Design an enzyme around this catalytic site. Structure first.
Site, PDB file in Angstrom:
ATOM      1  N   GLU A  11     -19.149  22.236  30.080  1.00  0.00           N
ATOM      2  CA  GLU A  11     -20.083  21.931  29.027  1.00  0.00           C
ATOM      3  C   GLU A  11     -21.353  21.215  29.426  1.00  0.00           C
ATOM      4  O   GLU A  11     -22.334  21.343  28.705  1.00  0.00           O
ATOM      5  CB  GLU A  11     -19.384  21.194  27.876  1.00  0.00           C
ATOM      6  CG  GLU A  11     -18.193  22.028  27.373  1.00  0.00           C
ATOM      7  CD  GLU A  11     -18.560  23.195  26.487  1.00  0.00           C
ATOM      8  OE1 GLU A  11     -19.816  23.297  26.203  1.00  0.00           O
ATOM      9  OE2 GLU A  11     -17.739  23.938  26.022  1.00  0.00           O
ATOM     10  N   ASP A  20     -26.732  25.672  21.885  1.00  0.00           N
ATOM     11  CA  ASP A  20     -25.711  26.181  22.779  1.00  0.00           C
ATOM     12  C   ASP A  20     -25.966  27.655  23.179  1.00  0.00           C
ATOM     13  O   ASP A  20     -26.999  28.228  22.834  1.00  0.00           O
ATOM     14  CB  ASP A  20     -24.302  25.907  22.257  1.00  0.00           C
ATOM     15  CG  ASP A  20     -23.855  26.796  21.105  1.00  0.00           C
ATOM     16  OD1 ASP A  20     -24.708  27.665  20.700  1.00  0.00           O
ATOM     17  OD2 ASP A  20     -22.791  26.705  20.574  1.00  0.00           O
ATOM     18  N   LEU A  32     -20.376  20.718  18.886  1.00  0.00           N
ATOM     19  CA  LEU A  32     -21.135  21.524  17.943  1.00  0.00           C
ATOM     20  C   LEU A  32     -21.511  20.725  16.710  1.00  0.00           C
ATOM     21  O   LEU A  32     -20.687  20.035  16.130  1.00  0.00           O
ATOM     22  CB  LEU A  32     -20.327  22.770  17.583  1.00  0.00           C
ATOM     23  CG  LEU A  32     -20.936  23.559  16.382  1.00  0.00           C
ATOM     24  CD1 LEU A  32     -22.202  24.304  16.830  1.00  0.00           C
ATOM     25  CD2 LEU A  32     -19.920  24.575  15.857  1.00  0.00           C
ATOM     26  N   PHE A 104     -11.290  24.434  22.703  1.00  0.00           N
ATOM     27  CA  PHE A 104     -12.431  23.567  22.561  1.00  0.00           C
ATOM     28  C   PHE A 104     -13.700  24.392  22.367  1.00  0.00           C
ATOM     29  O   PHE A 104     -14.587  24.087  21.593  1.00  0.00           O
ATOM     30  CB  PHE A 104     -12.537  22.706  23.830  1.00  0.00           C
ATOM     31  CG  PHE A 104     -13.671  21.677  23.813  1.00  0.00           C
ATOM     32  CD1 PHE A 104     -14.979  22.070  24.122  1.00  0.00           C
ATOM     33  CD2 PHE A 104     -13.405  20.322  23.590  1.00  0.00           C
ATOM     34  CE1 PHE A 104     -16.019  21.132  24.149  1.00  0.00           C
ATOM     35  CE2 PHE A 104     -14.430  19.375  23.639  1.00  0.00           C
ATOM     36  CZ  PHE A 104     -15.739  19.789  23.896  1.00  0.00           C
ATOM     37  N   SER A 117      -2.962  38.606  24.915  1.00  0.00           N
ATOM     38  CA  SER A 117      -3.077  37.714  26.044  1.00  0.00           C
ATOM     39  C   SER A 117      -2.089  36.549  25.939  1.00  0.00           C
ATOM     40  O   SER A 117      -1.527  36.111  26.927  1.00  0.00           O
ATOM     41  CB  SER A 117      -4.459  37.124  26.109  1.00  0.00           C
ATOM     42  OG  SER A 117      -5.397  38.169  26.186  1.00  0.00           O
ATOM     43  N   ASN A 132      -6.279  41.199  30.592  1.00  0.00           N
ATOM     44  CA  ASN A 132      -6.480  41.318  29.162  1.00  0.00           C
ATOM     45  C   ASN A 132      -7.485  40.279  28.615  1.00  0.00           C
ATOM     46  O   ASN A 132      -8.282  40.560  27.715  1.00  0.00           O
ATOM     47  CB  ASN A 132      -5.132  41.253  28.422  1.00  0.00           C
ATOM     48  CG  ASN A 132      -5.244  41.423  26.926  1.00  0.00           C
ATOM     49  OD1 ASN A 132      -5.435  40.466  26.159  1.00  0.00           O
ATOM     50  ND2 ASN A 132      -5.171  42.659  26.494  1.00  0.00           N
TER      51      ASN A 132
END
Ligand SMILES: [Cl-]
Ligand SMILES: [Cl-]
Length: 162
Positions: A11, A20, A32, A104, A117, A132
């Site tokens: 990040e 972002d 966010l 996250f 998955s 996948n």
């Protein structure tokens, strides 16, 4: 290496409101603020999250505080989710960090959407899960970060982060 250091690499840290990869107003370590186009709506969300009039800027301590809250919330959301929890419970420590990283980034709902998955990871079919996971908008939009997370799922080591 741990979840905090992992997410801090993925990040970055910015002390001033920024947009972002999706064009959304964010601050600190990937926090966010809003999906609204309005910069004023983001400053309002920010002041509300911080508990002061920030005029769009925060300190390192404040960024780290939001960060600690967001990691805590990602974990708690996984444990509360009927689809994620069993996966998480099944993984070793390193791979658990990988799942937290995805939550996250894209939220619990979004991850819970990776039906096939998740089934593969729970079965410990690492190579198949890696293949996948890559067939996704997530991988195509943020390939470098996705590859680091996927390699972590495949190997169960922190090599992609060293
Ligand atoms: Cl908040
Ligand atoms: Cl990327």
């Amino acid at each position: 290496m741990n979840i905090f250091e992992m997410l801090r690499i993925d990040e970055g840290l910015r002390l001033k409101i920024y947009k972002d990869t999706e064009g959304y107003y964010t601050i600190g370590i990937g926090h966010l603020l809003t999906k609204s186009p309005s910069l004023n709506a983001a400053k309002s969300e920010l002041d509300k999250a911080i508990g002061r009039n920030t005029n769009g800027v925060i300190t390192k301590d404040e960024a780290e505080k939001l960060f600690n809250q967001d990691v805590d919330a990602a974990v708690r959301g996984i444990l509360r989710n009927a689809k994620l929890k069993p996966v998480y419970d099944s993984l070793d420590a390193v791979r658990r960090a990988s799942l937290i990283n995805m939550v996250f980034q894209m939220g619990e709902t979004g991850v819970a959407g990776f039906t096939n998955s998740l089934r593969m990871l729970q079965q410990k079919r690492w190579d198949e899960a890696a293949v996948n996971l890559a067939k996704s908008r997530w991988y195509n939009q943020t390939p470098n970060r996705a590859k680091r997370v996927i390699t972590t799922f495949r190997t169960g080591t922190w090599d992609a982060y060293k």
